[PDB]
């Protein structure tokens, strides 16, 4: 009995299967993250990603920033997280513009791990990527706003 | 079989390992909400222009209207100017 | 660095990094358009000479100006 096996049975594809890679807990969790919802409209997945990340970025900017100890503007240091959402959204946009042309099909895999034919994720299309970028921007600005809306009754404001 | 000249995606491991392929767990009305509101940002060229000009003018605004209580560079020196080694 | 380390070391290292990127979830959603490789042999001679020279000039300039102007005399 051995825990490590080749990836999907093929020992000459360069990888391995471990509790870290192929595990029911891990496979379910990764499968239930927005990026891995291949049939969903990329705009909604971008909404979720942007909401989570934009919400996250507020913390370090406010607590570690230069105005951190001037509580009058230190709280308002969330503008910086907003600006980073802007810059990241630029990076996404030029990534898609550079990566996908107008009429090209998805570059995502069209097979499953078990060999059956799959429909490829539209995220890897020019239109799908543009939708994911718009969703990440909207959700990101929105998540920053939501985090900034809560200044109260938290052990680390 | 792991080698098939007919299907090389299977032969070369071109799979979606963690792709769910399940239907949307996002309920509608939420979906239509974000679909109608994030729609103007789904044109990548237009979004690029809106981000460069919007963020650029935003930056110009917070830079032009900054207060010396925030930036020492606007506050300027508040001390009597010192004297150089031999000169002013 | 660029003058003492030579290329093959970095090329093998970058191969391990390519493997790392392709086998990392969420990140392998992102693909490079240009294959990452180690800098060329000559290119490293140039890059290292440029760092050596920029550091040379900027170091001596800082010392020159600070040591003179600080005294102005």
């Amino acid at each position: 009995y051995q825990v490590v096996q080749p990836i999907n049975g093929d020992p000459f594809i360069g990888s391995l299967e471990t509790p870290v890679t192929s595990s029911p807990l891990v496979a379910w969790y990764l499968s239930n993250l927005p990026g891995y919802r291949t049939a969903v409209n990329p705009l909604l997945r971008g909404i979720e990603v942007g909401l989570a990340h934009g919400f996250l970025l507020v913390g370090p900017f406010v607590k570690a920033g230069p105005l951190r100890n001037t509580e009058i503007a230190g709280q308002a240091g969330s503008l910086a997280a907003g600006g980073l959402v802007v810059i990241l959204s630029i990076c996404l946009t030029i990534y898609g513009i550079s990566s996908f042309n107008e009429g090209d099909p998805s570059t995502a895999p069209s097979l499953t791990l078990t060999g059956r034919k799959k429909q490829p994720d539209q995220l890897q299309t020019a239109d799908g990527w543009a939708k994911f970028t718009g969703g990440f921007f909207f959700g990101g600005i929105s998540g920053v706003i939501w985090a900034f809306f809560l200044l109260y009754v938290l052990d680390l404001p | 079989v792991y080698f098939d000249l007919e299907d090389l995606g299977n032969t070369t491991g071109q799979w979606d390992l963690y792709g769910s392929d399940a239907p949307s767990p996002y309920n509608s009305l939420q979906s239509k909400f974000f679909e109608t509101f994030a729609a103007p940002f789904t044109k990548r060229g237009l979004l690029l222009k809106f981000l460069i000009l919007g963020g650029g003018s935003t930056l110009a605004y917070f830079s032009a209207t900054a207060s010396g209580d925030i930036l020492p560079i606007k506050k300027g020196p508040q001390l009597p100017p010192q004297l150089g080694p031999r000169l002013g | 660095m660029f003058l003492i380390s030579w290329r093959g070391y970095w090329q093998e290292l970058i191969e391990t990094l390519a493997w790392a990127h392709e086998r990392t979830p969420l990140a392998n959603l992102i693909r490079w358009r240009d294959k990452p490789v180690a800098l060329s042999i000559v290119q490293a001679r140039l890059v290292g000479l440029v760092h050596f020279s920029v550091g040379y000039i900027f170091t001596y300039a800082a010392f020159l100006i600070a040591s003179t102007s600080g005294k102005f005399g």
Partner: peptide
């Protein structure tokens, strides 16, 4: 006042635009 406009203009906006544009030109395929 003017430095508060042009220092971020050429130190932030101009490098972002130039880097993005050059990125596009450099990644283009004809």
């Amino acid at each position: 006042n003017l430095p508060s406009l042009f220092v971020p203009l050429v130190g932030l906006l101009f490098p972002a635009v130039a880097m993005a544009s050059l990125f596009l030109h450099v990644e283009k395929r004809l």
